Swiss-Prot record:
Function (record text): Electron carrier protein. The oxidized form of the cytochrome c heme group can accept an electron from the heme group of the cytochrome c1 subunit of cytochrome reductase. Cytochrome c then transfers this electron to the cytochrome oxidase complex, the final protein carrier in the mitochondrial electron-transport chain.
Modified residues (N-acetylglycine): G1
Keyword Iron: yes
Protein's cellular compartments: Mitochondrion intermembrane space
Post-translational modification remark: Binds 1 heme c group covalently per subunit.
Similarity section: Belongs to the cytochrome c family.
Record: residues binding heme c: C14, C17, H18, M80
Domain of life: Eukaryota
Gene Ontology MF term list: electron transfer activity; heme binding; metal ion binding
Species: Katsuwonus pelamis
Keyword set, alphabetical order: Acetylation, Electron transport, Heme, Iron, Metal-binding, Mitochondrion, Respiratory chain, Transport
Stated name of the protein: Cytochrome c
Gene3D superfamilies registered for this protein in UniProt: Cytochrome c-like domain
Keyword Transferase: no
Amino acid sequence: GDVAKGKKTFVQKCAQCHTVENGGKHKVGPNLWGLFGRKTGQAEGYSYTDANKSKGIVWNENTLMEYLENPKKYIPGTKMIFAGIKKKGERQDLVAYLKSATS
Ligand code: HEC
């Protein structure tokens, strides 16, 4: 159900870039393994200084709305090229997308 729609948006803006299976393997964004337990940083090879870290943090139910918001204002300076996602509809659904596919 509304996790269907996350992967739809997932093949539309998150799909072609991240991998997704067990360590899928990097290629632009590392594997996004299991959002649920980790702070920003340390995931199997990183790269980069402030951003992601800098701010330094936690992946949690929130903070992915936090990010999901728009990568401009928030760890503001992430090297991931993104436009937006600044809507309740698509932004809610994402946060379900990562809790059904990631774990
Ligand atoms: C669909 C909207 C995408 C979602 C959801 C995520 N990304 Fe990305 N993303 C990209 C990069 C390069 C990073 C790592 C590099 C850097 O910004 O410092 C990421 C990282 C994430 C993270 C990071 C998780 C962690 O800390 O380990 C999350 C939660 C995640 N992204 C969500 C780059 C790209 C990207 C390429 C163009 C696309 C289109 C997306 N990201 C899309 C999503």
